[PDB]
Design a protein around this ligand. Structure first.
Ligand SMILES: C[C@@H]1[C@H]([C@H](C(=O)O)[C@@H](C)O)N=C(C(=O)O)[C@H]1S[C@@H]1CN[C@H](C(=O)N(C)C)C1
Ligand SMILES: [Zn+2]
Ligand SMILES: [Zn+2]
Length: 219
């Protein structure tokens, strides 16, 4: 791929989009979202981190002859909801919870076109399920479950195994994060792949590892 956007196949219908941003002192580092393909229809889980990443993603999807039906953003930060304004211009439906829209509005950013007003939401009929586990990385963070592939998109609610801390905690509830994670652990014992917002894909250990990081940071 390019220095802005890499795509990695996770299964027949599911791609991981990895978008890059310069964050000193690490150089270029990736944010992960998904593309889910349902027949002639494509769906974005999180927007890429840069507007350029997003335009390259739209081109790569539309170059397969797929219509981008919808996008769901997993929290109010730029590495998940950064290109809500572009998608809304292109008349691609954006989905965000009422909590995500509250925090976008509070930070003077455009809200989603469509509001999720439930703790569980069927983002793509029989293909993608949204769950709100409670506060963790942010008040508003959600996870996305792909029942056909047994893929859980954790976003920034979930840390990579290698990560030894929680990253940016300025909007975090470190006290609730372990109880929130226990809900996700209890809901998805069948998860084969967990996608963190940053770093390597893994198994359920990533859930238990994030819970442990959070339990220790309270000390
Ligand atoms: C500041 C970041 C980024 C921010 C965030 O989502 O809080 C984003 C808004 O810039 N996501 C974050 C997080 O805490 O999850 C942080 S860490 C970032 C992603 N992985 C890299 C990392 O921590 N490495 C060890 C390479 C840098
Ligand atoms: Zn974040
Ligand atoms: Zn992040």
């Amino acid at each position: 791929g390019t220095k802005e956007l890499k795509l990695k196949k996770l299964s027949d219908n599911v791609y991981q989009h990895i978008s890059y941003k310069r964050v000193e002192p690490w150089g270029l580092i990736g944010a992960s979202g998904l593309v889910v393909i349902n027949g002639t229809e494509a769906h974005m889980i999180d927007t890429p981190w840069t507007t350029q990443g997003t335009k390259q993603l739209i081109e790569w999807i539309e170059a397969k002859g797929l219509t981008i039906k919808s996008a769901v953003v997993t929290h109010f930060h730029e590495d998940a909801s950064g290109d809500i304004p572009l998608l809304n211009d292109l008349k691609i439906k954006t989905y965000a919870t009422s909590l995500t829209n509250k925090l976008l509005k509070l930070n003077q950013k455009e809200v989603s076109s469509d509001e999720i007003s439930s703790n569980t939401f069927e983002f793509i009929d029989g293909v993608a399920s949204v769950f709100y586990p409670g506060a963790g990385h942010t008040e508003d963070n959600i996870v996305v479950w792909l029942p056909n592939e047994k893929i859980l998109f954790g976003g920034c609610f979930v840390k990579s195994l290698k990560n030894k801390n929680l990253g940016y905690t300025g909007d975090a509830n470190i006290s609730e994060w372990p109880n929130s994670m226990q809900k996700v652990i209890n809901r998805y014992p069948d998860a084969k792949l967990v996608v963190p917002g940053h770093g390597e894909v893994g198994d359920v250990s990533l859930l238990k590892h994030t819970q442990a990081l959070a339990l220790s940071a309270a000390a």
